[PDB]
């Protein structure tokens, strides 16, 4: 039902190796659809999904210019941030920003987001009100003061409630055969003896989209959270995702264990067992 659009900016300094690299990537849900990289032979916002290719030159020109402007702004920002933390000119540092909008089945705004991090630590975030900020430390308070003075929150609210939702809706229509199609996991349980008295049961979910999924093991109907090995959801490379959950069980007790799968592509949760 619900959908999100997100942009991810990464600016990385690299003293002695040129000016900071700026990359911007845009997603609808788990589908990347645009990318800009300041290191490219010829930097421009470029399509990464077929449904965005139909946008005209005016579109690509706007996005390229914004991204070239950002390349410069984020460089100046990294210099400011180095100063705020009294850091050496010799070290490399990273500034990240993630922003965008969430909409429900009816296409209406659920909420907007704009958050930044410096060297992997939260730095400043636009609050859910789209009008005020939460600064992580005294450095970020300096940024907050600048942003307040520049009426940045007003600009973000206008974007998040306006263009963000409008264009997300347009993308969802233009890419409706994929963006609005949930592919359910293909599920199966494998069995791997460890010893004469224990075996691993591994419950697999393959070929699903979007990435969000829940895989849990129960023993006699009791959840096995602490005793489950759950790998991170990983991309297959064909838009879909994979995940598994494993539990070590006493030999001959395999039928007491059930794997439970929830995915938006499934009408009702699935229960599976090892089928020898």
């Amino acid at each position: 039902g619900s959908h999100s659009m997100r942009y991810f900016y990464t600016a990385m300094s690299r003293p002695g190796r040129g000016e900071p690299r700026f990359i911007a990537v845009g997603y609808v849900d788990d589908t990347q659809f645009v990318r800009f990289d300041s290191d490219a032979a010829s930097p421009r916002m470029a399509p990464r999904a077929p449904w965005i290719e139909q946008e005209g030159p005016e579109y690509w020109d706007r996005e390229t210019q914004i991204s070239k402007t950002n390349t410069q702004t984020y460089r100046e920002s990294l210099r400011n941030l180095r100063g705020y933390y009294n850091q050496s000119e010799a070290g490399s540092h990273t500034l990240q920003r993630m922003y965008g909008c969430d909409v429900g089945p009816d296409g209406r705004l659920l909420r907007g987001h704009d958050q930044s991090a410096y060297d992997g630590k939260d730095y400043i975030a636009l609050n859910e009100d789209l009008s005020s900020w939460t600064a992580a430390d005294t450095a970020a308070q300096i940024t907050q003061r600048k942003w307040e003075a520049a009426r940045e929150a007003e600009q973000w609210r206008a974007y998040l409630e306006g263009l963000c939702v409008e264009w997300l809706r347009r993308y969802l229509e233009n890419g409706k055969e994929t963006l609005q199609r949930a592919d359910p996991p293909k599920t199966h349980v494998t069995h791997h003896p460890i010893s004469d008295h224990e075996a691993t049961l591994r419950c697999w979910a393959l070929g699903f989209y979007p990435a969000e999924i829940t895989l849990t093991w129960q023993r006699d109907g009791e959840d096995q959270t602490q005793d489950t090995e759950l790998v991170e959801t990983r991309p297959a490379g064909d838009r879909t995702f994979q995940k598994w959950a494993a539990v070590v069980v006493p030999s001959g007790e395999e039928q007491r264990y059930t794997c439970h799968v929830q995915h938006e592509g499934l009408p009702k949760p699935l229960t599976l067992r090892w089928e020898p």
């Binding site: 990464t10 990359i23 992997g120 630590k121 393959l206 297959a236």
Partner: protein, 99 residues
């Protein structure tokens, strides 16, 4: 801060000896973004390996998928070799058909 990479090595499709497939090495949860990833065929670096565009999760850590086309056998052994500022030496993760 610095975060060390998680590494998963796996195939796009269920592995079938003699059938063309994709070998994946997914690196994630790391910070900063500079990372060295090689795919190995019996200890040797595969030359044409693509990767996804740098992005990152909600917790700010980076992730990348490195992938190459391959055709698995009973013989050939595959691995992913990863270097990062957090590691004192490269980490090698063997492809295991069941993982």
């Amino acid at each position: 801060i610095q975060r060390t990479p998680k590494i998963q090595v796996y195939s796009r499709h269920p592995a079938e000896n003699g059938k063309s497939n994709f070998l994946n090495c997914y690196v994630s949860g790391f910070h900063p973004s500079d990372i060295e990833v090689d795919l190995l065929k019996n200890g040797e670096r595969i030359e044409k390996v693509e990767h996804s565009d740098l992005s990152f999760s909600k917790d700010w850590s980076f992730y990348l998928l490195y992938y190459t086309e391959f055709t698995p056998t009973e013989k050939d052994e595959y691995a992913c070799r990863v270097n990062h500022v957090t590691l004192s030496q490269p980490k090698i993760v063997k492809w295991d058909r069941d993982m």
